[PDB]
Design a protein around this nucleic acid. Structure first.
Ligand SMILES: CC(=O)[C@H]1O[C@@H](OC2=CCC(/C=C(\C)C(=O)N[C@@H]3[C@H](O)[C@@H](O)[C@H]4OCO[C@H]4[C@@H]3O)=CC2=O)[C@@H](O)[C@@H]1O
Ligand SMILES: NC(=[NH2+])NCCC[C@H](N)C(=O)O
Ligand SMILES: [Mg+2]
Ligand SMILES: [Mg+2]
Ligand SMILES: [Mg+2]
Ligand SMILES: [Mg+2]
Ligand SMILES: [Mg+2]
Ligand SMILES: [Mg+2]
Ligand SMILES: [Mg+2]
Ligand SMILES: [Mg+2]
Ligand SMILES: [Mg+2]
Ligand SMILES: [Mg+2]
Ligand SMILES: [Mg+2]
Ligand SMILES: [Mg+2]
Ligand SMILES: [Mg+2]
Ligand SMILES: [Mg+2]
Ligand SMILES: [Mg+2]
Ligand SMILES: [Mg+2]
Ligand SMILES: [Mg+2]
Ligand SMILES: [Mg+2]
Ligand SMILES: [Mg+2]
Ligand SMILES: [Mg+2]
Ligand SMILES: [Mg+2]
Ligand SMILES: [Mg+2]
Ligand SMILES: [Mg+2]
Ligand SMILES: [Mg+2]
Ligand SMILES: [Mg+2]
Ligand SMILES: [Mg+2]
Ligand SMILES: [Mg+2]
Ligand SMILES: [Mg+2]
Ligand SMILES: [Mg+2]
Ligand SMILES: [Mg+2]
Ligand SMILES: [Mg+2]
Ligand SMILES: [Mg+2]
Ligand SMILES: [Mg+2]
Ligand SMILES: [Mg+2]
Ligand SMILES: [Mg+2]
Ligand SMILES: [Mg+2]
Ligand SMILES: [Mg+2]
Ligand SMILES: [Mg+2]
Ligand SMILES: [Mg+2]
Ligand SMILES: [Mg+2]
Ligand SMILES: [Mg+2]
Ligand SMILES: [Mg+2]
Ligand SMILES: [Mg+2]
Ligand SMILES: [Mg+2]
Ligand SMILES: [Mg+2]
Ligand SMILES: [Mg+2]
Ligand SMILES: [Mg+2]
Ligand SMILES: [Mg+2]
Ligand SMILES: [Mg+2]
Ligand SMILES: [Mg+2]
Ligand SMILES: [Mg+2]
Ligand SMILES: [Mg+2]
Ligand SMILES: [Mg+2]
Ligand SMILES: [Mg+2]
Ligand SMILES: [Mg+2]
Ligand SMILES: [Mg+2]
Ligand SMILES: [Mg+2]
Ligand SMILES: [Mg+2]
Ligand SMILES: [Mg+2]
Ligand SMILES: [Mg+2]
Ligand SMILES: [Mg+2]
Ligand SMILES: [Mg+2]
Ligand SMILES: [Mg+2]
Ligand SMILES: [Mg+2]
Ligand SMILES: [Mg+2]
Ligand SMILES: [Mg+2]
Ligand SMILES: [Mg+2]
Ligand SMILES: [Mg+2]
Ligand SMILES: [Mg+2]
Ligand SMILES: [Mg+2]
Ligand SMILES: [Mg+2]
Ligand SMILES: [Mg+2]
Ligand SMILES: [Mg+2]
Ligand SMILES: [Mg+2]
Ligand SMILES: [Mg+2]
Ligand SMILES: [Mg+2]
Ligand SMILES: [Mg+2]
Ligand SMILES: [Mg+2]
Ligand SMILES: [Mg+2]
Ligand SMILES: [Mg+2]
Ligand SMILES: [Mg+2]
Ligand SMILES: [Mg+2]
Ligand SMILES: [Mg+2]
Ligand SMILES: [Mg+2]
Ligand SMILES: [Mg+2]
Ligand SMILES: [Mg+2]
Ligand SMILES: [Mg+2]
Ligand SMILES: [Mg+2]
Ligand SMILES: [Mg+2]
Ligand SMILES: [Mg+2]
Ligand SMILES: [Mg+2]
Ligand SMILES: [Mg+2]
Ligand SMILES: [Mg+2]
Ligand SMILES: [Mg+2]
Ligand SMILES: [Mg+2]
Ligand SMILES: [Mg+2]
Ligand SMILES: [Mg+2]
Ligand SMILES: [Mg+2]
Ligand SMILES: [Mg+2]
Ligand SMILES: [Mg+2]
Ligand SMILES: [Mg+2]
Ligand SMILES: [Mg+2]
Ligand SMILES: [Mg+2]
Ligand SMILES: [Mg+2]
Ligand SMILES: [Mg+2]
Ligand SMILES: [Mg+2]
Ligand SMILES: [Mg+2]
Ligand SMILES: [Mg+2]
Ligand SMILES: [Mg+2]
Ligand SMILES: [Mg+2]
Ligand SMILES: [Mg+2]
Ligand SMILES: [Mg+2]
Ligand SMILES: [Mg+2]
Ligand SMILES: [Mg+2]
Ligand SMILES: [Mg+2]
Ligand SMILES: [Mg+2]
Ligand SMILES: [Mg+2]
Ligand SMILES: [Mg+2]
Ligand SMILES: [Mg+2]
Ligand SMILES: [Mg+2]
Ligand SMILES: [Mg+2]
Ligand SMILES: [Mg+2]
Ligand SMILES: [Mg+2]
Ligand SMILES: [Mg+2]
Ligand SMILES: [Mg+2]
Ligand SMILES: [Mg+2]
Ligand SMILES: [Mg+2]
Ligand SMILES: [Mg+2]
Ligand SMILES: [Mg+2]
Ligand SMILES: [Mg+2]
Ligand SMILES: [Mg+2]
Ligand SMILES: [Mg+2]
Ligand SMILES: [Mg+2]
Ligand SMILES: [Mg+2]
Ligand SMILES: [Mg+2]
Ligand SMILES: [Mg+2]
Ligand SMILES: [Mg+2]
Ligand SMILES: [Mg+2]
Ligand SMILES: [Mg+2]
Ligand SMILES: [Mg+2]
Ligand SMILES: [Mg+2]
Ligand SMILES: [Mg+2]
Ligand SMILES: [Mg+2]
Ligand SMILES: [Mg+2]
Ligand SMILES: [Mg+2]
Ligand SMILES: [Mg+2]
Ligand SMILES: [Mg+2]
Ligand SMILES: [Mg+2]
Ligand SMILES: [Mg+2]
Ligand SMILES: [Mg+2]
Ligand SMILES: [Mg+2]
Ligand SMILES: [Mg+2]
Ligand SMILES: [Mg+2]
Ligand SMILES: [Mg+2]
Ligand SMILES: [Mg+2]
Ligand SMILES: [Mg+2]
Ligand SMILES: [Mg+2]
Ligand SMILES: [Mg+2]
Ligand SMILES: [Mg+2]
Ligand SMILES: [Mg+2]
Ligand SMILES: [Mg+2]
Ligand SMILES: [Mg+2]
Ligand SMILES: [Mg+2]
Ligand SMILES: [Mg+2]
Ligand SMILES: [Mg+2]
Ligand SMILES: [Mg+2]
Ligand SMILES: [Mg+2]
Ligand SMILES: [Mg+2]
Ligand SMILES: [Mg+2]
Ligand SMILES: [Mg+2]
Ligand SMILES: [Mg+2]
Ligand SMILES: [Mg+2]
Ligand SMILES: [Mg+2]
Ligand SMILES: [Mg+2]
Ligand SMILES: [Mg+2]
Ligand SMILES: [Mg+2]
Ligand SMILES: [Mg+2]
Ligand SMILES: [Mg+2]
Ligand SMILES: [Mg+2]
Ligand SMILES: [Mg+2]
Ligand SMILES: [Mg+2]
Ligand SMILES: [Mg+2]
Ligand SMILES: [Mg+2]
Ligand SMILES: [Mg+2]
Ligand SMILES: [Mg+2]
Ligand SMILES: [Mg+2]
Ligand SMILES: [Mg+2]
Ligand SMILES: [Mg+2]
Ligand SMILES: [Mg+2]
Ligand SMILES: [Mg+2]
Ligand SMILES: [Mg+2]
Ligand SMILES: [Mg+2]
Ligand SMILES: [Mg+2]
Ligand SMILES: [Mg+2]
Ligand SMILES: [Mg+2]
Ligand SMILES: [Mg+2]
Ligand SMILES: [Mg+2]
Ligand SMILES: [Mg+2]
Ligand SMILES: [Mg+2]
Ligand SMILES: [Mg+2]
Ligand SMILES: [Mg+2]
Ligand SMILES: [Mg+2]
Ligand SMILES: [Mg+2]
Ligand SMILES: [Mg+2]
Ligand SMILES: [Mg+2]
Ligand SMILES: [Mg+2]
Ligand SMILES: [Mg+2]
Ligand SMILES: [Mg+2]
Ligand SMILES: [Mg+2]
Ligand SMILES: [Mg+2]
Ligand SMILES: [Mg+2]
Ligand SMILES: [Mg+2]
Ligand SMILES: [Mg+2]
Ligand SMILES: [Mg+2]
Ligand SMILES: [Mg+2]
Ligand SMILES: [Mg+2]
Ligand SMILES: [Mg+2]
Ligand SMILES: [Mg+2]
Ligand SMILES: [Mg+2]
Ligand SMILES: [Mg+2]
Ligand SMILES: [Mg+2]
Ligand SMILES: [Mg+2]
Ligand SMILES: [Mg+2]
Ligand SMILES: [Mg+2]
Ligand SMILES: [Mg+2]
Ligand SMILES: [Mg+2]
Ligand SMILES: [Mg+2]
Ligand SMILES: [Mg+2]
Ligand SMILES: [Mg+2]
Ligand SMILES: [Mg+2]
Ligand SMILES: [Mg+2]
Ligand SMILES: [Mg+2]
Ligand SMILES: [Mg+2]
Ligand SMILES: [Mg+2]
Ligand SMILES: [Mg+2]
Ligand SMILES: [Mg+2]
Ligand SMILES: [Mg+2]
Ligand SMILES: [Mg+2]
Ligand SMILES: [Mg+2]
Ligand SMILES: [Mg+2]
Ligand SMILES: [Mg+2]
Ligand SMILES: [Mg+2]
Ligand SMILES: [Mg+2]
Ligand SMILES: [Mg+2]
Ligand SMILES: [Mg+2]
Ligand SMILES: [Mg+2]
Ligand SMILES: [Mg+2]
Ligand SMILES: [Mg+2]
Ligand SMILES: [Mg+2]
Ligand SMILES: [Mg+2]
Ligand SMILES: [Mg+2]
Ligand SMILES: [Mg+2]
Ligand SMILES: [Mg+2]
Ligand SMILES: [Mg+2]
Ligand SMILES: [Mg+2]
Ligand SMILES: [Mg+2]
Ligand SMILES: [Mg+2]
Ligand SMILES: [Mg+2]
Ligand SMILES: [Mg+2]
Ligand SMILES: [Mg+2]
Ligand SMILES: [Mg+2]
Ligand SMILES: [Mg+2]
Ligand SMILES: [Mg+2]
Ligand SMILES: [Mg+2]
Ligand SMILES: [Mg+2]
Ligand SMILES: [Mg+2]
Ligand SMILES: [Mg+2]
Ligand SMILES: [Mg+2]
Ligand SMILES: [Mg+2]
Ligand SMILES: [Mg+2]
Ligand SMILES: [Mg+2]
Ligand SMILES: [Mg+2]
Ligand SMILES: [Mg+2]
Ligand SMILES: [Mg+2]
Ligand SMILES: [Mg+2]
Ligand SMILES: [Mg+2]
Ligand SMILES: [Mg+2]
Ligand SMILES: [Mg+2]
Ligand SMILES: [Mg+2]
Ligand SMILES: [Mg+2]
Ligand SMILES: [Mg+2]
Ligand SMILES: [Mg+2]
Ligand SMILES: [Mg+2]
Ligand SMILES: [Mg+2]
Ligand SMILES: [Mg+2]
Ligand SMILES: [Mg+2]
Ligand SMILES: [Mg+2]
Ligand SMILES: [Mg+2]
Ligand SMILES: [Mg+2]
Ligand SMILES: [Mg+2]
Ligand SMILES: [Mg+2]
Ligand SMILES: [Mg+2]
Ligand SMILES: [Mg+2]
Ligand SMILES: [Mg+2]
Ligand SMILES: [Mg+2]
Ligand SMILES: [Mg+2]
Ligand SMILES: [Mg+2]
Ligand SMILES: [Mg+2]
Ligand SMILES: [Mg+2]
Ligand SMILES: [Mg+2]
Ligand SMILES: [Mg+2]
Ligand SMILES: [Mg+2]
Ligand SMILES: [Mg+2]
Ligand SMILES: [Mg+2]
Ligand SMILES: [Mg+2]
Lengths: 77, 59
RNA sequence: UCCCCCGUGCCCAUAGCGGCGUGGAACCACCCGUUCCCAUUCCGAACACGGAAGUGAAACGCGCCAGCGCCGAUGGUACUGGGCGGGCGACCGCCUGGGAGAGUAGGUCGGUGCGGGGGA
RNA sequence: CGCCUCCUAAAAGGUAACGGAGGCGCCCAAAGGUCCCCUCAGGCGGGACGGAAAUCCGCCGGAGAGCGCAAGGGUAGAAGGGGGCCUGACUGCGAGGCCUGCAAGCCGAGCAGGGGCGAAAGCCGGGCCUAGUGAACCGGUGGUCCCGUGUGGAAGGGCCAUCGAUCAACGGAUAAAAGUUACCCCGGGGAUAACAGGCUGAUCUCCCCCGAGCGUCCACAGCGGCGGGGAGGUUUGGCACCUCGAUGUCGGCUCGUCGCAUCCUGGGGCUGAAGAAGGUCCCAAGGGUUGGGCUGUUCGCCCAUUAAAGCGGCACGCGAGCUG
RNA sequence: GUGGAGCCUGGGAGUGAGGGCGCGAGCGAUAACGUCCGCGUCCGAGCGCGGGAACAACCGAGACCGCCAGCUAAGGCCCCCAAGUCUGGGCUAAGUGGUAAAGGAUGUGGCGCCGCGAAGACAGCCAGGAGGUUGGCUUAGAAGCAGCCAUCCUUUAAAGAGUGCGUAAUAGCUCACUGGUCGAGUGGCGCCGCGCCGAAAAUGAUCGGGGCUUAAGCCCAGCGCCGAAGCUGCGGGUCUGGGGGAUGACCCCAGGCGGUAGGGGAGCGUUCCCGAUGCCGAUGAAGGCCGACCCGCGAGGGCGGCUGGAGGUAAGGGAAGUGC
RNA sequence: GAGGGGUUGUGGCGUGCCUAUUGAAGCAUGAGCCGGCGACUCACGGUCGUGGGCGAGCUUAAGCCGUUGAGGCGGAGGCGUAGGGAAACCGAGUCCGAACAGGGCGCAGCGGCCGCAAAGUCCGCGGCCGUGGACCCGAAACCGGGC
């Protein structure tokens, strides 16, 4: 009587970090994600681990472009 | 146009957010009556605790 | 400001597959060549250059067709936030607000911005 | 026993169990940077040796292939395949954030230095991404030339860089460590086991439903395949709720008392009941229910009888009643 | 949205054994007063109050004090027991109500749905119910009625080579079946309400008791009342806020005032020091014993009577061997 | 002596105290009863808060003189007035750096001259922390010297 399971890894706290309409500053992280569930749009960069982050001060805007994917933009103020 | 709200059933045993609604309306004692302006935000809390409360449209 | 074409976007299949039909003046393509620039793990197929005899066969564009694909109500129901009841339980109901998915009726052989060449 | 992936996880994040499944402790000098080009698996048809599958041709085929390895996410409008030139698998920094008890971990535009690729826009501070890891202390090595015990040196340190961890019990007590105690002791706990009780009833005991089939014939005299529903709380357990500043334990003896699912005696129905004797079910707890051999035994087997030699509960009834 | 809301800095903690319940899952056995998470809640700390017979966490409700006043909540209104032997419609006959399942049943009531019937049904009585056929797989019997790979005729009013019983076979009874007889209903389904059985456990029973049957049970619809420390009336306290008024002078208005670990505030008393070369004291100190008196929320402080017989010590401050 | 004191017949209501616990009247701990003794302190340092003194300053220690319940002197020293850096060192800056870059750590009164209010510091007081047995009582044990 013994279990060969019992393992699991720490949760990674993924997901969107700033929702549409939120005021962000340049460098603010907007999305933590595995792969390109969201794609960087206007004024949004993407780091080696697919993290989306704002390139300028402004306002977050989401856009669903169908087969082109979902995008995150930052509209400057 | 206003709302006369009477607390008629105790919030003991009810979820804390329903206790908070009572506080937003200023209702702190049983059988207490309050007359509040009839706005959507006030009406939102009155409806939240409607099972605790008695409502009457006034003036 | 209308019609055709050529670039280039946007919506993201109501825009696709398939079948048929259509167009070469213009534009586009195939085409004619491989000297020259450039090119093939072999091949001028591609990429590329110089051309202008031909053909809209291929491709592209534009039509028509609902076999497929895609979209899809209304109504009803499941489920449910909040409020209540019932059952020993597995579970089952009522009130108020919300309300699918499947399926049915049906829809669809695209719509539109900007520039350019041509036509009236 | 740390780390990664999925689920559990209740559509933000997070979320436990000795819950359900798998992986890591590496690797790559290209499997890295950039520029350019290319597009799969699979199905059908065609083709010497040649096959289900080697390589070739055509048609269909949006992604089911591939992406070093688990899983997931992502992905051809490339992160997949090929080639050229390369070393950014940079130095000095770093706005702003993610995550978060701390300490860690993570993402990062932009500026300067000197570069790589590109005509350029630009990209490049390793790798599609998430595992591939180890704080201090102590010490090694290269550099720096900062300290140098009256002074000049030197010894020895500091600083920069890098090294030695299955410290894997993976936030890592020491540089260095196994057993035994029925000869045991103290402090504690009913926070936690052994007894009894309790809750539960899987297991146990008993009673039913269904009616295959048996019974020469005939489902039900007596039986009851495969399955189905309960009752009881005497078994073995589950759980850990009162009791560990103590609730004495098996068996016997003594003394009873109760339940009835009845062993006998009394009353019945059915019978595959001729009679006698039985079988099966129903009612019935008033009374009764032997002596002995074996064994600590309960139980059981045996001997001789008997109307019968019932089975259970009472802290497995009863040690301030005895035994031991 | 002005709340014992929120944010910032800092002082002091305690807690890091939880538990029941509802919902959502995992584990367990679609077990546990089981176990492990999530959302909520209550108990913990509300073992304070009403209801639930009794009972931490179910229902009602958040107890500042007082009243021989009023309204309600849950739950109740026949008596124990405060308020209806209240009103109208229905059901149950089981004391069901007042603990259970598969399953079984001419219990009862309300619905639908077939038929068959005055072209005479059902029930009863009355006949008939028949040849092929001791039939075919067939022998060891298989003759309608031990299993099959069959249901066909014939005479008829009517009749299955056959419903059930019987034989080893046969026969026999008798069904579906047709005729006469009476003279209006009869047989079969399905659904809903309420009941019946299935229902055995151990000291004496019981729905909390008594007792209840057009209920004092159950379902539907009402009116009244009773009922808590909830709410109201009256009076008071304290704190906070707002006014007075200017400031703690007191008043008026409003609101808060359950509480374990724990934080904070304000006080009482004990021993001692300054005050004190003072003052109280034999016309009686301290201590003791009474008191139904006065002040204080309280810890306490006065005052009076008795005892006692020599000490005690103010306003205001100081210090600790300070309260069992 | 229209009040009060004692007693208690009947009726209503009603689960000791403490401790420990999720939960006790609990059949869990402790207590026969009474009286007396009985447990959060002190020193030094620290950190906040607070009442005062002084303020770019504040303050003394051991001693010495006096007093005989009189205070005074004593500036050695301590904290503060500058930080940054491992350090050399520089300094309202400094460190990393090639940097004149970027970043880390630093740098700053109300009034009509006098007030006030304030760095800071001294002393009192209070909370809590460190060191001591540090709230009190309690082992089994370990060690030394003897009997
Ligand atoms: C006795 C004490 O001092 C304290 O312990 C508590 O009591 C008891 C503790 C244990 C116990 C039984 C144990 C350990 C056991 O293993 N018992 C089995 C079996 O169950 C038993 O029936 C016998 O079967 C044949 O041999 C026995 C067999 O060993 C019985 C008790 O009564 C407490 O109340 C007392 O104060
Ligand atoms: N309105 C709602 N959210 N209803 C929830 C339905 C759940 C409930 N048990 C029912 O079946 O009725
Ligand atoms: Mg294992
Ligand atoms: Mg697991
Ligand atoms: Mg692990
Ligand atoms: Mg985690
Ligand atoms: Mg986890
Ligand atoms: Mg995870
Ligand atoms: Mg998200
Ligand atoms: Mg990058
Ligand atoms: Mg990458
Ligand atoms: Mg939008
Ligand atoms: Mg945009
Ligand atoms: Mg009301
Ligand atoms: Mg309530
Ligand atoms: Mg309340
Ligand atoms: Mg309640
Ligand atoms: Mg709520
Ligand atoms: Mg909410
Ligand atoms: Mg109230
Ligand atoms: Mg075009
Ligand atoms: Mg546009
Ligand atoms: Mg087409
Ligand atoms: Mg044509
Ligand atoms: Mg065409
Ligand atoms: Mg042409
Ligand atoms: Mg032509
Ligand atoms: Mg050539
Ligand atoms: Mg030439
Ligand atoms: Mg060519
Ligand atoms: Mg070409
Ligand atoms: Mg030509
Ligand atoms: Mg053509
Ligand atoms: Mg083309
Ligand atoms: Mg059409
Ligand atoms: Mg859609
Ligand atoms: Mg649909
Ligand atoms: Mg709808
Ligand atoms: Mg609900
Ligand atoms: Mg429902
Ligand atoms: Mg609804
Ligand atoms: Mg609705
Ligand atoms: Mg849905
Ligand atoms: Mg739909
Ligand atoms: Mg179409
Ligand atoms: Mg277009
Ligand atoms: Mg254009
Ligand atoms: Mg145009
Ligand atoms: Mg034009
Ligand atoms: Mg960790
Ligand atoms: Mg999750
Ligand atoms: Mg999840
Ligand atoms: Mg989640
Ligand atoms: Mg977070
Ligand atoms: Mg384990
Ligand atoms: Mg493993
Ligand atoms: Mg290469
Ligand atoms: Mg192929
Ligand atoms: Mg082939
Ligand atoms: Mg061949
Ligand atoms: Mg082949
Ligand atoms: Mg793949
Ligand atoms: Mg692998
Ligand atoms: Mg490449
Ligand atoms: Mg390359
Ligand atoms: Mg080069
Ligand atoms: Mg930062
Ligand atoms: Mg952090
Ligand atoms: Mg990590
Ligand atoms: Mg550069
Ligand atoms: Mg450069
Ligand atoms: Mg460059
Ligand atoms: Mg160049
Ligand atoms: Mg460049
Ligand atoms: Mg960069
Ligand atoms: Mg890679
Ligand atoms: Mg790569
Ligand atoms: Mg990797
Ligand atoms: Mg690391
Ligand atoms: Mg060490
Ligand atoms: Mg060192
Ligand atoms: Mg050196
Ligand atoms: Mg030197
Ligand atoms: Mg020397
Ligand atoms: Mg020297
Ligand atoms: Mg020399
Ligand atoms: Mg020197
Ligand atoms: Mg030298
Ligand atoms: Mg040296
Ligand atoms: Mg280093
Ligand atoms: Mg080492
Ligand atoms: Mg391992
Ligand atoms: Mg460890
Ligand atoms: Mg270790
Ligand atoms: Mg590790
Ligand atoms: Mg260490
Ligand atoms: Mg070590
Ligand atoms: Mg060593
Ligand atoms: Mg060891
Ligand atoms: Mg060790
Ligand atoms: Mg040992
Ligand atoms: Mg031994
Ligand atoms: Mg031994
Ligand atoms: Mg021995
Ligand atoms: Mg011995
Ligand atoms: Mg001995
Ligand atoms: Mg021995
Ligand atoms: Mg010993
Ligand atoms: Mg002991
Ligand atoms: Mg100990
Ligand atoms: Mg002990
Ligand atoms: Mg126990
Ligand atoms: Mg434990
Ligand atoms: Mg136990
Ligand atoms: Mg035990
Ligand atoms: Mg036990
Ligand atoms: Mg046991
Ligand atoms: Mg046992
Ligand atoms: Mg016992
Ligand atoms: Mg036990
Ligand atoms: Mg017990
Ligand atoms: Mg018992
Ligand atoms: Mg039980
Ligand atoms: Mg059972
Ligand atoms: Mg049972
Ligand atoms: Mg069982
Ligand atoms: Mg039974
Ligand atoms: Mg049967
Ligand atoms: Mg047979
Ligand atoms: Mg028979
Ligand atoms: Mg049979
Ligand atoms: Mg039977
Ligand atoms: Mg059986
Ligand atoms: Mg069963
Ligand atoms: Mg069974
Ligand atoms: Mg039992
Ligand atoms: Mg038992
Ligand atoms: Mg057990
Ligand atoms: Mg047991
Ligand atoms: Mg167990
Ligand atoms: Mg236990
Ligand atoms: Mg226990
Ligand atoms: Mg537990
Ligand atoms: Mg014990
Ligand atoms: Mg004792
Ligand atoms: Mg005891
Ligand atoms: Mg004892
Ligand atoms: Mg035993
Ligand atoms: Mg007995
Ligand atoms: Mg019986
Ligand atoms: Mg008998
Ligand atoms: Mg008999
Ligand atoms: Mg006989
Ligand atoms: Mg016989
Ligand atoms: Mg016979
Ligand atoms: Mg018999
Ligand atoms: Mg019978
Ligand atoms: Mg019978
Ligand atoms: Mg008897
Ligand atoms: Mg008897
Ligand atoms: Mg007997
Ligand atoms: Mg003998
Ligand atoms: Mg003998
Ligand atoms: Mg014997
Ligand atoms: Mg024996
Ligand atoms: Mg013997
Ligand atoms: Mg035996
Ligand atoms: Mg034997
Ligand atoms: Mg005999
Ligand atoms: Mg006999
Ligand atoms: Mg015997
Ligand atoms: Mg027994
Ligand atoms: Mg037992
Ligand atoms: Mg036993
Ligand atoms: Mg016993
Ligand atoms: Mg016994
Ligand atoms: Mg005994
Ligand atoms: Mg004894
Ligand atoms: Mg004994
Ligand atoms: Mg005894
Ligand atoms: Mg005894
Ligand atoms: Mg005794
Ligand atoms: Mg005893
Ligand atoms: Mg004996
Ligand atoms: Mg012995
Ligand atoms: Mg509060
Ligand atoms: Mg608070
Ligand atoms: Mg405030
Ligand atoms: Mg605080
Ligand atoms: Mg404090
Ligand atoms: Mg404190
Ligand atoms: Mg604690
Ligand atoms: Mg603590
Ligand atoms: Mg702990
Ligand atoms: Mg814990
Ligand atoms: Mg616990
Ligand atoms: Mg818990
Ligand atoms: Mg636990
Ligand atoms: Mg629960
Ligand atoms: Mg729960
Ligand atoms: Mg419910
Ligand atoms: Mg449920
Ligand atoms: Mg649940
Ligand atoms: Mg779960
Ligand atoms: Mg069961
Ligand atoms: Mg539990
Ligand atoms: Mg449970
Ligand atoms: Mg459970
Ligand atoms: Mg809870
Ligand atoms: Mg507690
Ligand atoms: Mg409560
Ligand atoms: Mg509470
Ligand atoms: Mg309570
Ligand atoms: Mg209670
Ligand atoms: Mg009470
Ligand atoms: Mg109660
Ligand atoms: Mg009660
Ligand atoms: Mg009662
Ligand atoms: Mg209770
Ligand atoms: Mg309870
Ligand atoms: Mg209150
Ligand atoms: Mg009333
Ligand atoms: Mg009521
Ligand atoms: Mg009653
Ligand atoms: Mg009455
Ligand atoms: Mg009534
Ligand atoms: Mg009546
Ligand atoms: Mg009966
Ligand atoms: Mg009854
Ligand atoms: Mg009964
Ligand atoms: Mg039934
Ligand atoms: Mg039934
Ligand atoms: Mg019936
Ligand atoms: Mg019925
Ligand atoms: Mg036959
Ligand atoms: Mg016959
Ligand atoms: Mg029954
Ligand atoms: Mg009536
Ligand atoms: Mg009342
Ligand atoms: Mg009252
Ligand atoms: Mg009140
Ligand atoms: Mg008042
Ligand atoms: Mg207050
Ligand atoms: Mg007042
Ligand atoms: Mg008041
Ligand atoms: Mg209080
Ligand atoms: Mg205070
Ligand atoms: Mg005092
Ligand atoms: Mg005192
Ligand atoms: Mg003195
Ligand atoms: Mg004096
Ligand atoms: Mg004197
Ligand atoms: Mg005098
Ligand atoms: Mg005298
Ligand atoms: Mg006198
Ligand atoms: Mg005195
Ligand atoms: Mg005295
Ligand atoms: Mg007095
Ligand atoms: Mg005298
Ligand atoms: Mg006196
Ligand atoms: Mg004297
Ligand atoms: Mg005095
Ligand atoms: Mg004084
Ligand atoms: Mg003391
Ligand atoms: Mg009197
Ligand atoms: Mg009295
Ligand atoms: Mg009296
Ligand atoms: Mg009375
Ligand atoms: Mg009592
Ligand atoms: Mg109690
Ligand atoms: Mg007491
Ligand atoms: Mg105690
Ligand atoms: Mg204890
Ligand atoms: Mg305990
Ligand atoms: Mg306990
Ligand atoms: Mg008691
Ligand atoms: Mg007792
Ligand atoms: Mg005890
Ligand atoms: Mg006791
Ligand atoms: Mg204890
Ligand atoms: Mg004693
Ligand atoms: Mg006494
Ligand atoms: Mg005493
Ligand atoms: Mg203290
Ligand atoms: Mg002391
Ligand atoms: Mg001290
Ligand atoms: Mg101090
Ligand atoms: Mg202090
Ligand atoms: Mg101070
Ligand atoms: Mg001063
Ligand atoms: Mg001075
Ligand atoms: Mg010093
Ligand atoms: Mg320094
Ligand atoms: Mg340096
Ligand atoms: Mg700077
Ligand atoms: Mg700064
Ligand atoms: Mg001053
Ligand atoms: Mg000061
Ligand atoms: Mg502290
Ligand atoms: Mg000490
Ligand atoms: Mg000590
Ligand atoms: Mg001490
Ligand atoms: Mg201390
Ligand atoms: Mg000894
Ligand atoms: Mg030792
Ligand atoms: Mg030793
Ligand atoms: Mg010695």
């Amino acid at each position: 009587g013994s279990t060969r399971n019992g393992r699991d890894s720490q949760a990674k706290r993924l997901g969107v970090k700033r929702y549409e309409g939120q005021v962000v500053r340049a460098g603010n992280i907007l999305v933590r994600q595995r792969g390109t569930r969201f794609k960087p749009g206007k004024n949004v960069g993407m780091g080696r681990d697919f993290t989306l982050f704002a390139l300028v001060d402004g306002v977050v805007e989401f856009q669903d472009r169908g087969r082109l994917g979902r995008y995150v933009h930052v509209r400057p103020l | 146009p206003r709302l006369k709200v009477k607390l008629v059933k105790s919030p003991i045993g009810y979820p804390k957010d329903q206790k908070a609604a009572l506080k937003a309306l200023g209702l702190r004692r049983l059988q207490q009556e309050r007359v509040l302006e009839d706005t959507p935000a006030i009406r939102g809390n009155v409806e939240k605790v409607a099972h605790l409360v008695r409502v009457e449209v006034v003036e």
